[PDB]
Amino acid sequence: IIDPWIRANFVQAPNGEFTVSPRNAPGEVLLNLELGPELNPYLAHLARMYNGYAGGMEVQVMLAGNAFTAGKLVFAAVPPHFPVENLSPQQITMFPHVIIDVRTLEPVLLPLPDVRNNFFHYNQKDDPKMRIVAMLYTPLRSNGVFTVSCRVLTRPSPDFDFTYLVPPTVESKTKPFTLPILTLGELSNSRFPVSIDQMYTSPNEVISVQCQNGRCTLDGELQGTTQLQVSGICAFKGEVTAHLQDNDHLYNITITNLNGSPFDPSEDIPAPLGVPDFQGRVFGVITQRDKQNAAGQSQPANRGHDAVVPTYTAQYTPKLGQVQIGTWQTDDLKVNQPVKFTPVGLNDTEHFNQWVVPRYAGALNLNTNLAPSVAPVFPGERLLFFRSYLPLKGGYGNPAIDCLLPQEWVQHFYQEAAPSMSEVALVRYINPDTGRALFEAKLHRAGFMTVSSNTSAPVVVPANGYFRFDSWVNQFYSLAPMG
Ligand SMILES: [Zn+2]
Missing domain, CATH: 2.60.120.20 (Jelly Rolls)
Incomplete structure (x- = not known):
């Protein structure tokens, strides 16, 4: 044959x-x-x-x-x-x-x-x-x-x-394992619903990260709270069950799954899929559409307002089924009616740490079923990130979310589900007008990239470059220096 x-x-x-x-x-x-x-x-x-x-x-x-x-x-x-x-x-x-x-x-x-x-x-x-x-x-x-x-x-x-x-x-x-041909003007961030701005190398104090969105192995195994929709990152939905008066207004919300099914707390997941995986004050829009019809031409009634979800506090407990929002001096939310949250950005850079995992079951409990921490092990290498920049509602600053994988690579790895021949795949970043490679990296089975660099700096690339899968290598492979 x-x-x-x-x-x-x-x-x-x-x-x-x-x-x-x-x-x-x-x-x-x-x-x-x-x-x-x-x-x-x-x-x-x-x-x-x-x-x-x-x-x-x-x-x-x-x-x-x-x-x-x-x-x-x-x-x-x-x-x-x-x-x-x-x-x-x-x-x-x-x-x-x-x-x-x-x-x-x-x-x-x-x-x-x-x-x-x-x-x-x-x-x-x-x-x-x-x-x-x-x-x-x-x-x-x-x-x-x-x-x-x-x-x-x-x-x-x-x-x-x-x-x-x-x-x-x-x-x-x-x-066979293939990698999709998409440029950085076509990729999207996987830890916040915005698009990717540039590639960046890790600081000297960042040697090990553990994030819970955008985690997916090369075999196509989603991990942590990782789901597949871009519209589901840092988003949730449910019903308002409580109200509280404070300097503000509080609106406790019982959340369900994003397909509409009720959330079972005994499932082997850290939290419902797609909740925010960092500490800070997530700014967005809360909205209600009622379930009964007040006269109105036989139509329901609607509300939509600005809100803040703080994820560093004792009342952000999505594993227990609860979340608390906040409207600054606005009280128009009906109790016992469904809500949906749409993320926009942050409010300020106060208590904002992107590599600190929230306590998903609150205080007095430990996080279970977490995706494992990643790190480089070869002497002289560091992590590579895809960096976007976020809107702020007020104050001063320039905040940034780094991610390990673009969302499109998560989707491609899920759809293909090819076996992994080794522990590390070698890739190169090709300039397609000449054919010369610009740098080379390692892509690990767990889903993260390491380069061989001494600086924490933005990576200056042309606009039409892409990654190309070249070979499967092992742990002893010595990358060429990036600088
Ligand atoms: Zn109130």
């Missing part, structure tokens, strides 16, 4: 690119890949039309170093159900292996067999398979800071074959 061009020529793997520097030590696994069609884009296209597969492959490795470096790498094949975590460089020579110097101008070849105890593999129902492992065999001396770039190419062996025809692109587990 396979075209004889495919069987004769090597094509770059989707898990292909890696690095080796003299900051690496012999004993660290630089490359750990698994057998299967995902190592070849033509086979990855043909795999979406069949049910199963069997067969081994052939791997070519290119190294790019000069005549001023020294050292040896080793590439070996490791069978299924063998532990890989405590391999030493002495043990890896007891496998089918190849040892190469870094000064060479010629690529390296290794066959990767398909050792199995059955007739074929299924695309669903995964099972362990053969792997290829690379570690540094002798220490790397770049005498006369020099990072060496490396690529992996594959092609099928003469015994590789596909088994049963299924309808194309229906069966999952064969879908």
Whole structure:
């Protein structure tokens, strides 16, 4: 079935690119890949039309170093159900292996067999398979800071074959990860219902964030209070159940879900979906349309006013089903009638902290079912944000919400739901008139981006640039410096 061009020529793997520097030590696994069609884009296209597969492959490795470096790498094949975590460089020579110097101008070849105890593999129902492992065999001396770039190419062996025809692109587990082609003038903020202004790198005191809107993994798993509508970010609806007099007016509100269903407090969610996930005074518009008809040509009556929702206080308890608003010196809200809130911005920058999570069940309770905190782990990297600027009702300031993902990428990751081949995907930011990349970043499975920078500053880009998915990499991959 396979075209004889495919069987004769090597094509770059989707898990292909890696690095080796003299900051690496012999004993660290630089490359750990698994057998299967995902190592070849033509086979990855043909795999979406069949049910199963069997067969081994052939791997070519290119190294790019000069005549001023020294050292040896080793590439070996490791069978299924063998532990890989405590391999030493002495043990890896007891496998089918190849040892190469870094000064060479010629690529390296290794066959990767398909050792199995059955007739074929299924695309669903995964099972362990053969792997290829690379570690540094002798220490790397770049005498006369020099990072060496490396690529992996594959092609099928003469015994590789596909088994049963299924309808194309229906069966999952064969879908490739794609990233949508949208510019920053077309993306939207995911933690507040405005549009994205620029890209920005994190401050020196921000090393770990935990937000609850705009959290979604690359596999398409919504987390926290993340929903899909832009009109539902920082918005809620329900009925007024209470009234209070103060300097102001208070209007306690029992909230429901945004589809109209009542909110069950025992669900595995921190709060109803789409409530604000930061501390501050959210400014917006509250509105009522009545449920009974006063005469009025057989129509209901309507109210709409300005309101403030403070989320740092003891009465912002959306997990318990309550929220309290405020109208400055206005009393026109009927009790026992439905309300809807539409967010506009903030009132002032008082008690405004964007990286502090509210107490969703109030005081005397702990937040449960929270999305996990994210952070960079590689030495010398920081978080990358998408920054918008918000309106204020009064006072002085220039407030800003940062987000981890654009809302359109959340939507695309939900609709596609492709499997993740590794822990980190390498992306680049392409200038489409020339083809030159501007910077490169890491995109993690949990849904956040890190760059290699020393400053907290806005990122100056052209107007038509976009991100492009290039490869799946591992944790040892060393990004080029952004500045
Ligand atoms: Zn009142």
